[PDB]
Design a protein around this ligand. Sequence first.
Ligand SMILES: Nc1ncnc2c1ncn2[C@@H]1O[C@H](COP(=O)(O)OP(=O)(O)O)[C@@H](O)[C@H]1O
Ligand SMILES: Nc1ncnc2c1ncn2[C@@H]1O[C@H](COP(=O)(O)OP(=O)(O)O)[C@@H](O)[C@H]1O
Ligand SMILES: [Mg+2]
Ligand SMILES: [Mg+2]
Lengths: 55, 458, 460
Amino acid sequence: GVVENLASEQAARMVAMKAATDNGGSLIKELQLVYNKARQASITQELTEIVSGAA
Amino acid sequence: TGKIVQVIGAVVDVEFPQDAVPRVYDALEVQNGNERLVLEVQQQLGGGIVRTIAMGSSDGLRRGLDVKDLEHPIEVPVGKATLGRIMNVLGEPVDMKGEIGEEERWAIHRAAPSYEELSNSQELLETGIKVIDLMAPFAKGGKVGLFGGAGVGKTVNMMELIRNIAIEHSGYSVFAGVGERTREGNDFYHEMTDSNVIDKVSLVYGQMNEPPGNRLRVALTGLTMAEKFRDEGRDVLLFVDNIYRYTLAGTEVSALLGRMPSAVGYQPTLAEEMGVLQERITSTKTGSITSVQAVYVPADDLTDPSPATTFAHLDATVVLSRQIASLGIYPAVDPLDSTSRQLDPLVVGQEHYDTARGVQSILQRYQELKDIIAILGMDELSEEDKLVVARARKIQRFLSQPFFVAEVFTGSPGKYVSLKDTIRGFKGIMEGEYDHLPEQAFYMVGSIEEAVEKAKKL
Amino acid sequence: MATGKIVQVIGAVVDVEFPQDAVPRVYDALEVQNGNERLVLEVQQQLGGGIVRTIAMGSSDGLRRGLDVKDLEHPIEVPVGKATLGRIMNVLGEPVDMKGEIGEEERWAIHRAAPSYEELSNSQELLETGIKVIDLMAPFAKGGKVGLFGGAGVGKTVNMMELIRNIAIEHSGYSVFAGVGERTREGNDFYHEMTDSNVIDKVSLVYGQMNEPPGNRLRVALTGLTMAEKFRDEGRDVLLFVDNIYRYTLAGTEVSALLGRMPSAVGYQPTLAEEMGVLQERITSTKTGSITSVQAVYVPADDLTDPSPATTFAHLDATVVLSRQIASLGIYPAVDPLDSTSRQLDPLVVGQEHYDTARGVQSILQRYQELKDIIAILGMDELSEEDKLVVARARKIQRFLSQPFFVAEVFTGSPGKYVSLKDTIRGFKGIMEGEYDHLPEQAFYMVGSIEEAVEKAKKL
Ligand SMILES: Nc1ncnc2c1ncn2[C@@H]1O[C@H](COP(=O)(O)OP(=O)(O)O)[C@@H](O)[C@H]1O
Ligand SMILES: Nc1ncnc2c1ncn2[C@@H]1O[C@H](COP(=O)(O)OP(=O)(O)O)[C@@H](O)[C@H]1O
Ligand SMILES: [Mg+2]
Ligand SMILES: [Mg+2]
C-alpha cells in the first residue's frame, strides 16, 4: 500500500505541474498585452509633453 | 456696440470701444441669423478685445456681426416657481409649458459659504443597499460620489438612491443632467410625472447633444437652484448626472482660450475649476444639501487626473469596477476601495464597524491568494486558506442585491435590506454559521433568511 | 564702471543688455547690487544683439528692471591652495563658517580643460582604506573613481566620513569634500564630526546647500574640482569626495529647463552625458600628481537604469553597492559582497594572494545562498557534514566583514577600528581554511582585526 501510494503521489504531482506550466503560459500572454499597452502609453505621453511643451 | 473679430470653434472674440469693454463673466448677445446667441466672456485680452464662449451652436457666425453687451452675468429663475419644470443652462423653460413665474433671478457665479457658516453632522442616512451602507455609510447633509468606468452601474445606482431616499424625504430635490443621454432625461421626467412626485423636483438638463458652453455651465445653473432652496432654511437633495463632463467641457475649450496643456492634455486650471464648483455644494448652519454625484473615470483609469482630483472632495466614495460586473454581481461595488468618512466606532457603533473591517480583511486576504490559485490551482492551499476562500466567495455573492429599478433587466423583484438586517447576515457568514449553504444560495437575495430559504431549491 | 542693464527677471533667469562692444563671453561672471547686498550672475548664453541670458547665483527676489550691472571679465574664480584647508566655502568661494576672510594667495577659474590623453600616466598603487570589505572586494588605484551605490539610509555619507578620517589620520593626505546639494543638517554633523576627530585641518569643504538656486548646486562640483586640481599641481595626491552625483544631475536638469532647452529621455537635459563628462574627466592621475575620487550616487527607486546612474557607470573604476536589507540585520558597513565589483580585482595588479582570497570569500557566500533554502525547508540537521561546515564558515565570514567605524562611535558608543589589508587577507584566509572553527560566530561581529576575535571569544 505504501509503495502504490508513492507511485500515485508521483503520478499526481506530474499532472499538477503540467497544469501549472500551462497556467503560467496562459498568464504570460495577458501580462504581455498589459505590458505593450503600457509601453505605448509611455511613448505617447513623453513625446507629447516634449512637442507640445516646445513653443 | 461690439464687433466679432474671430470665431474658433466654440470660442468667439469680440472687439469693444476702449471705455465700454465688458467685465469677466458678463453675458453678451448676437443675432445668429434667425436666432439669438448668448456669449459669456472668459478673458479680457488687451486693447478692447474680449474672448467669449458661445452658449449655443457657433455655426453660421460671420465676422463683423454686431454684439450687444448685457451688463449682468447669466441669471436663472430660482425658488419655488422653478419646481417641477425643465430648464436650459440659460434658465429658459425647455418643456412646452408656459413661462416660469419666477419672482427672483440669481447669477450662477457665486462665492462658497464661509468657513464660519459650515456645519457638520453625524446623523446617518439609511439606504436599502447592503454594500453601500455597510462599507460606506453616508450621513445627512454630506457628499457621496459613485466612481466607475463606462457602463458599470453608476446611473442605476443613482436611480435606486433616488427611489430609496428621495420619495421618503420631505424637502425639495434638484437633479442636474450634465452631459448625459437625453433618452435618460426623458425617461426620468416621465417616471417622476407618472408617480406624481414631479412637483417636488426641479430639473436642469444640459445633455450630450449640446455644444461645450452648455455642458460647461449647466452644473452651476443647477447648483444655483440648490443654493436658493438651501438658504430658504430647507434641506435639499442634489443629484448630478455626471460631473466629469463638467471638466471635460473645460478641456475641450481650454486650448482655444490660448492656455498651455497640462499633464494628459487637461486644462492647467483643472483642480481650481473643480474646486470652485464643489466648494459651494455643502450644507450650512442655515440649511443642508445632501448630494450624490456620478463620476465617470476614463478608460477605467482611477489615477487619471480628473478622478484623482475629485476623490478629495467627497465624504463617501463608492468605486464600481468592471471586473465585478462581468461576474454578474450587481451592484458592482468594489468593497476594497469604497470608503466613508462616517465609518468610525464612534459614529456607527462598534458592531457595524467591526463587521465592516472583518469583511475588508477577509476580502483582502482573498485578493492576496488569487495569484497562487491562478498558477498552482486551489488544491495547494492550506486547509484553512480554503476556508478563507470559501467565505470570501460567499461574501462576494452576498453583497449582490436586486433593485427595484433593475426589474426591467432581470425580472426579479427588488429588495430593500435594512442595516440591522445586514450586519447580522455578514456577522453570520463570517463567524461560520452558514458554511452548509452553496455559494449560489447567496447570489441576488435580500436578507440572509432568503439565502437559507433559497438553498432548499439549490 | 557698470556698463549693462537688466531687462528681464523671470524666476532665477536674468537677461542683461550691454553695448554690442562689451558683450560678456559665456561663463563670464557679472555683478549687481540686489539691494544692500551683492549678487553675481553667470552668463549662460549670448542671444541676439547685446543681450545676454544669465543664471543668478543667489536670491533673485528684489531685482528691478534697469539695475546697473558690472561685468567681471573672468569666470567665477575661487581661492585655492593651502589657505582653504579647514574652511567652509560656498560656490563663489566665500567663507560661510564665520571665521572671516580666507587669506587666499591665488584664485583660479572653475572652468578649465581636461588633461590630454598625452599627459596621463597609468598607475596601479592601490589605495588602502582601512575598511575590511572595501579593501578586499573593491580595490581601487590612485587616480581611480569609486561609486557608492544604494538607496536612502544605507550608509553612503558615513562611509565617506570614515574614508575621510582614515585617509587624513593614517596617511596624512589632503582631501576635498564637495557637498553638491547638501542637507544643512548633514553638513553641520559633518563639520562637527571632522573637528571632533581632529581631521578638519586637512580637509577643505565646499557646500552648495539644497535651499539655493540651481546654478549653485550645479557649479559647486567644479569649485571643489578646482581646489583639488590646485593641490594636484603641487605634486600631492588629493582625494575628492562628491556627496551626491544624483543631485548634480538634478541641478543640471533644473538649469536646462529654466533656460528653456528642449528636454530628452525622462525629462533630463539634452546635455546630460556631456556635463557628466566635463566633470568626471578632470579627475585623473597626471604625471605631476593624482586626484582620486569617491562618489556617492543615489539610485532612485532601486532601478539602476534611469539616465543618471546609467550615465555615471561609464566613468567609475569600482562600484560598492549598499543594501538596506543587510543594514537592517545590523551588519554595518552594509556592503553587499556579491554585487560590488572592481576593474582592479585581477591577479596581475592585486597579486594571486588577494585575488584568491576574494574569490574564495565570494564562493563561500554564493554557496551559502544555495544552502539557505534547504536549511529552511528540510532543517539543518539534514545537511552533509561538509555542508554544515560551509554554513558555519559562511556565517563567520559574513560576520567578519562588519566593522566598527571611528565616526560611528556617536551612534553606538563602540570604539572604532582601523584594519590593514595584510590583516584582512590573513583573517579571511584563516577563516576559510578552518583555522578558527573553534570560535563562536558572535566572536567575529563588529570585531575589527582577527586577533581581536580571539580576544573577544574568551569573554563570551
Ligand atoms: N442592479 C443591477 N441589476 C442588473 N443589471 C444592472 C444593475 N445595475 C446595472 N446593471 C446593468 O448595467 C448596465 C449599465 O447601465 P448603467 O447603470 O446605466 O451604466 P452607466 O452607469 O454608464 O449609465 C445596465 O443597463 C444593466 O444592464
Ligand atoms: N556604520 C554605522 N554604524 C552605525 N550607524 C550607522 C552606520 N552607517 C549608517 N548608520 C546609520 O544610518 C543613518 C544614515 O546613514 P547615511 O550614511 O546618512 O545614509 P545615506 O547613505 O542615505 O546618507 C545614520 O543616522 C546612522 O545612524
Ligand atoms: Mg450613465
Ligand atoms: Mg547621503
